[model samples]
Target: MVSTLPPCPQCNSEYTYEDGALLVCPECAHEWSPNEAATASDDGKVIKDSVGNVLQDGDTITVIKDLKVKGSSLVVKVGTKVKNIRLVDGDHDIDCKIDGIGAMKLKSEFVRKVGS
Candidate 1:
């Protein structure tokens, strides 16, 4: 009996077939080891900027739009500089600390990688 693996990481194609110890995708010409394919499902979200640049933890970013705090009247104005961000799994992918806001979650699309 043969076991099927998860989708291709490059193209998200589910039609992956095993050839010996590697999983190959015909649609995208992407291949990965069985171990890598197994963990791809849990690799977490791909945080990207408005310009499609991939983001990572501890990367400084600038807010592209004004974000208002849910309960209070405080508003994190556009162009706010966020430092040492932590990427998390959710709609708000970035966890960061601003000067006045302290700790907050910001969406990845709303921020662009600083110095990039």
Candidate 2:
């Protein structure tokens, strides 16, 4: 798996190996996956949002349901628009900031990508 893997984007480390679906760099402890690649690959592989629409960084999304902020009194209402998303590897896969909410993370299952 190390034969053709890419370098660590966080630290420019040459020591990188595939960790299952993610790439790990020993020199920097950077972890990234195809789902969260800032720069896409040429292989046509991609991560799709629910309903099979492809997702990419900086894409806008709308919340499909109300979500409570953990350990807070705040609740994010349905149809909240999230802009400039950054995909990441986790249960909460979409990183974004909403108006009046500062920074927040969302799951791909609960959002619909916005487009013209």
State which candidate has the highest TM-score. Answer: 1
RMSD in angstroms, all models? Answer: 8.4, 13.5
- Pairs with steric clashes in candidate 1: none
Stretches of candidate 2 off by over 4 Å are 1-47, 90-92
Roughly what TM-score does model 1 have, to 2 decimal places? 0.56
Error (Å) of candidate 1 at residue 6 is 17
Candidate 1 stretches with Cα past 4 Å from truth are 1-20, 23-44
Candidate 1, residues 11-82, lDDT tens digits: the string is: 775778888778888888777885754564455465777756767788878878887789556776777787
Tens digit of per-residue lDDT, candidate 2, span 6-80:
666777656778878788777766677645676754643333456457567888777777777885567767777
lDDT of 1: 0.74
Candidate 1 contains a number of clashing pairs equal to: 0
lDDT of each: 0.74, 0.69
